[PDB]
Amino acid sequence: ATFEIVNRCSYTVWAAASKGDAALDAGGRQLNSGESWTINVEPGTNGGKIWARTDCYFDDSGSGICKTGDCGGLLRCKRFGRPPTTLAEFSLNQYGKDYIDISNIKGFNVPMNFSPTTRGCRGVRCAADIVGQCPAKLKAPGGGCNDACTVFQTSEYCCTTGKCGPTEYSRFFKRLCPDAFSYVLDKPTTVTCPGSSNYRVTFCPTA
């Protein structure tokens, strides 16, 4: 499957793509404002994620640091990124269909649209100014808006027992972005697409 990743932000981002225990395609790349990077994701990929990283520095070996979404200091991510990270999430070719969503469960750093480029389903978007409106206690000094699990490490925010409810913090994310997951047991906003669809992830879609 192809994913075109497009940076419409006025600032550089470092795109990242991983399924948690491996890179997808090259795993990461710099995208200056306006640049597009197309990756190939193997059919059947389960639990894939794409995200933006901000304020990165990398040496020639591709080692360094980002202020949001850092994946163990690598340009080319093999693992998931450090919150806060707006997440494009997908599982492909799962009994004949693809499943996509956007999640704020690991916080928010960059606004995002995640849409099919082929027929048969709609896209999802979280493009509100969540960083600007972020509750004081969730603001990440390094940048972005943390989720409450990251900040407070409670069973209720992290849904550790599989029994949690919405919270004042999850409701903030849900108010600003109704079409993204705001906590683990949120009413799902997953979209079913035809199996083997192709996609576009756009950072700052309303820029």
Positions touching Na ion (CB under 5 A) are: 51-52, 66, 70-71, 85-86, 103, 105, 110-111, 127, 135, 147-148, 169-170, 204-206
Taken in order 98, 189, 120, 41, is the CA torsion positive or negative? Answer: negative
Q: Residue 180 CB, nearest distance to Na ion (Å)?
A: 9
Task: Pick between residue 1 and residue 114 the one whose CB is nearest to Na ion.
Answer: 114
Task: Pick between residue 45 and residue 86 the one whose CB is nearest to Na ion.
Answer: 86
> Cα–Cα distance between 44 and 65 in angstroms, integer?
31
Q: Residue 86 CB, nearest distance to Na ion (Å)?
A: 4
Those residues with Cβ within 8 angstroms of residue 97's Cβ, 6 or more apart along the chain or in another chain: 192, 193, 194, 195
Under 8 Å between Cβ of 105 and 147: yes
Under 8 Å between Cβ of 105 and 183: yes
Q: Residue 125 CB, nearest distance to Na ion (Å)?
A: 8
Q: In this chain, which residue has its C-beta nearest to Na ion?
A: 103
Q: Residue 192 CB, nearest distance to Na ion (Å)?
A: 17
